[PDB]
Amino acid sequence: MRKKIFKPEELRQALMPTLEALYRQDPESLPFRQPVDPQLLGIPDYFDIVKNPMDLSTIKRKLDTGQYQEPWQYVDDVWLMFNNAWLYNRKTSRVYKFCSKLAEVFEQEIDPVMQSLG
Ligand SMILES: COC(=O)c1cccc(C(=O)Nc2ncnc3nc[nH]c23)c1
């Protein structure tokens, strides 16, 4: 099977608008722009529950520097960010609701872009 047919710089160009769409969500992107800081947020159990943290700044730096070698690796990091927030936070919470808003934006933005890689 063929692997890594796209250049990382091709993935950067194709996928960047889906990431920019998340950054444009105000105020829903604000809890996701920087890594969760458990000390600042007073949630000392965060790293016990969330074993692989992810946030927009980490995704952005990986995409900007061509670290994604397959399109699904980017998609998996975005989903990891969402799934961590839904896992840790109460379904009734503001962060949980804001996560769901971002995931809805991402779903609408990502489907046509993945088709354009077909
Ligand atoms: C620059 O950072 C901020 O301004 C800000 C504002 C409000 C909330 C947060 C924040 O990270 N809250 C979170 N609490 C629990 N779990 C989470 N998962 C993602 N964010 C989570 C950040």
Side-chain angles (χ1 to χ4, degrees), residues 30-37 41 43 46 85 88-89 94-95:
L30 297 178
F32 298 89
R33 286 177 164 255
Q34 297 178 44
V36 171
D37 181 344
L41 295 170
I43 46 177
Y46 185 83
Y88 182 75
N89 292 279
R94 185 174 184 270
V95 174

Side-chain angles (χ1 to χ4, degrees), residues 2 17 19 30-31 53-55 74 112 117:
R2 289 188 170 90
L19 185 65
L30 297 178
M54 187 56 56
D55 70 295
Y74 165 81
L117 294 176

Side-chain angles (χ1 to χ4, degrees), residues 28-89:
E28 293 92 347
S29 69
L30 297 178
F32 298 89
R33 286 177 164 255
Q34 297 178 44
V36 171
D37 181 344
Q39 183 183 2
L40 174 61
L41 295 170
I43 46 177
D45 68 334
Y46 185 83
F47 286 146
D48 297 320
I49 291 168
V50 177
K51 294 185 176 182
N52 296 112
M54 187 56 56
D55 70 295
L56 286 173
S57 80
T58 301
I59 299 173
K60 176 176 176 293
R61 296 168 193 196
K62 287 174 70 172
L63 191 64
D64 283 345
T65 60
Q67 293 181 50
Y68 292 119
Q69 291 186 284
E70 302 275 18
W72 68 74
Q73 293 174 333
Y74 165 81
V75 174
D76 285 344
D77 269 356
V78 175
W79 289 347
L80 176 59
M81 168 179 65
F82 296 152
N83 287 325
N84 288 343
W86 286 324
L87 172 72
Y88 182 75
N89 292 279

